[PDB]
Design a protein around this ligand. Sequence first.
Ligand SMILES: Nc1ncnc2c1ncn2[C@@H]1O[C@H](COP(=O)(O)OP(=O)(O)OP(=O)(O)O)[C@@H](O)[C@H]1O
Ligand SMILES: Nc1ncnc2c1ncn2[C@@H]1O[C@H](COP(=O)(O)OP(=O)(O)OP(=O)(O)O)[C@@H](O)[C@H]1O
Ligand SMILES: Nc1ncnc2c1ncn2[C@@H]1O[C@H](COP(=O)(O)OP(=O)(O)OP(=O)(O)O)[C@@H](O)[C@H]1O
Lengths: 539, 107
Amino acid sequence: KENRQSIINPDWNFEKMGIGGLDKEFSDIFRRAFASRVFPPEIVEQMGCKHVKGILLYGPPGCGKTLLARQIGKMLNAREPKVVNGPEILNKYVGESEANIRKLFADAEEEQRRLGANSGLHIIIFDEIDAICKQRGSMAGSTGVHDTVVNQLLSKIDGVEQLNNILVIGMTNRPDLIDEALLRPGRLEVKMEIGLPDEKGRLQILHIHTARMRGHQLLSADVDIKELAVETKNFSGAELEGLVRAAQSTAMNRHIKASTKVEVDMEKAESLQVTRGDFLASLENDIKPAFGTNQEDYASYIMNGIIKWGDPVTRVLDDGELLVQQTKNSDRTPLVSVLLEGPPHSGKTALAAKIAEESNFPFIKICSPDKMIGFSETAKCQAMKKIFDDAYKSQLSCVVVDDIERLLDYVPIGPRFSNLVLQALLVLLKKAPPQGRKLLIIGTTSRKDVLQEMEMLNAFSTTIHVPNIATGEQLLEALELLGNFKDKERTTIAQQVKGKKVWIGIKKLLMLIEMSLQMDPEYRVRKFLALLREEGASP
Amino acid sequence: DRTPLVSVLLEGPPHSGKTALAAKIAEESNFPFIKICSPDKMIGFSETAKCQAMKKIFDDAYKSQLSCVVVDDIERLLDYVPIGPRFSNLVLQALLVLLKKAPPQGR
Ligand SMILES: Nc1ncnc2c1ncn2[C@@H]1O[C@H](COP(=O)(O)OP(=O)(O)OP(=O)(O)O)[C@@H](O)[C@H]1O
Ligand SMILES: Nc1ncnc2c1ncn2[C@@H]1O[C@H](COP(=O)(O)OP(=O)(O)OP(=O)(O)O)[C@@H](O)[C@H]1O
Ligand SMILES: Nc1ncnc2c1ncn2[C@@H]1O[C@H](COP(=O)(O)OP(=O)(O)OP(=O)(O)O)[C@@H](O)[C@H]1O
């Protein structure tokens, strides 16, 4: 009796493979690939369907492709897979690459010819498949060796003769360069995408990578995984594995004295522990992601924090909260916009960054003009296009565009500016993203009239005003919050300024105070007043 | 500490001897890195090159704990001529953006 030897090893447990955050992808792969080989063969023969012989995996670096491939190779009860490490098949002579490819499908052919339908399963793994296979005719100058390899591969996977007992797996990082004729159904059907995880996936990974430590009581009692899951934002699996190793190394480093002449290991290795301080240090010093925006940017954009010197500082934030709530909840207006306005030295960028921070959205990015110094027009256009494209991929996103008047080069003489960048902005502000996704755009500028004159202010849904310090009470409140002057001096300052109206931006006040402090203690207040008197006003 | 970047403009009528005073101030600062970005070394350069050379001089100054950079004849740097008027816009934008870029934290 030709017993239907299961293609699944008897001792196989999903938890054994130790993959986290990829339940749906694995479910789909298992359904569309290995479903036909597990059910009793009589029904399948009645249906008359032939099995699938292809899988393709792609995604950004460090998401877990090779792990899936290795685990799948280990799961099946079949012969050892044949693995190709990049372009191992190219050779100098003529007609040796094609032979090297043909040598891979020998056992499959012979076994199919001998045993017919009742045959084992043969697996072949391709790694970095974009090194050998490419669009036919794109390359030129290789002497014709990168144009027959693809033809041989195509003729072999599915040709006049028919095989039914192979499974080819491919991995790549640039899915757009592979040949089109190699992706049609019947050759490489199941195309999957492996992407960054969400909070639950990160928690699963962090639980998978600490089970061994937790088992042996080497992990302290104050380590809470939820906080780490929340704090590590935009991390990909590889980074989440690296952080734990960094913490472990910093924990082990406390028992080695290497400054002395000879390395010596103390015998307090017993009672070892890993404390939360190690995790915080590892987060703050060693590992840093490579996607999205991080603390290194919000540190620079908001340099001196936010202080409540009056009423407007709350009004602006409340309006931002209302706008973000509207963006998140509603469904009939996927795209929203807003404009921030005010006189120079008012603090527009800080408020925009604060609102973006408090939005709490998954994806945040900032497009400032100081990262493209010396660029021509086309470079600016392409950079903006790339940022917005990366913004489209996610579910709901927020983007900030600061200093519009210098993103397009404006100078009153003339006037002069770039038409291309203006057209790019005017077209990008009226493009809705793919269905089921939401986008918020904030913009900052210091000259409303020019924008009105160019007919760009009609593309913004609404505008928000950013006022400026106007009364002595607000100035006294600002001074008391900053607390650089003493009460005795503050009495004279109030006695003087309160009998007048002031007009001075917040950012200018810090510079004025810093300039004032340089003088001697006895002449400070006077100097400060003088500077204020020279500032003037023009409401 | 609050303000890591400060700047100042020396101005006056012609033939008054102002670049010498700026050089003296820079020399008496006693800072480690002191460099003079002058148009004497940009004869025949197009706009792209002026912009890139300015950027390099301003990048070399981000790798020292203290610095002082002198710009000379802002008028000649823009190629300004009273007729028209006519000048370069890319260089002006570079300058206007390069006077507000704070250095890496701690310098
Ligand atoms: N889902 C996951 N669960 C557990 N560990 C993971 C996971 N994803 C990644 N890792 C860790 O990170 C490594 C990811 O390396 P992998 O070979 O999968 O990367 P890759 O996507 O092929 O990268 P490359 O772009 O360099 O080709 C795994 O070996 C494991 O160390
Ligand atoms: N209430 C506040 N709102 C905004 N910024 C504040 C406030 N209090 C203090 N600041 C500080 O003021 C500075 C804000 O300067 P910012 O870069 O926003 O200026 P700006 O108005 O965009 O300038 P410019 O008009 O020159 O383009 C930051 O240091 C911020 O920390
Ligand atoms: N007290 C002083 N201040 C300035 N320059 C002085 C003084 N005493 C002597 N000099 C000399 O005067 C000359 C100053 O010329 P400088 O190069 O400063 O001209 P400038 O004002 O920059 O010229 P221009 O406006 O035509 O470009 C130098 O020789 C300097 O040595």
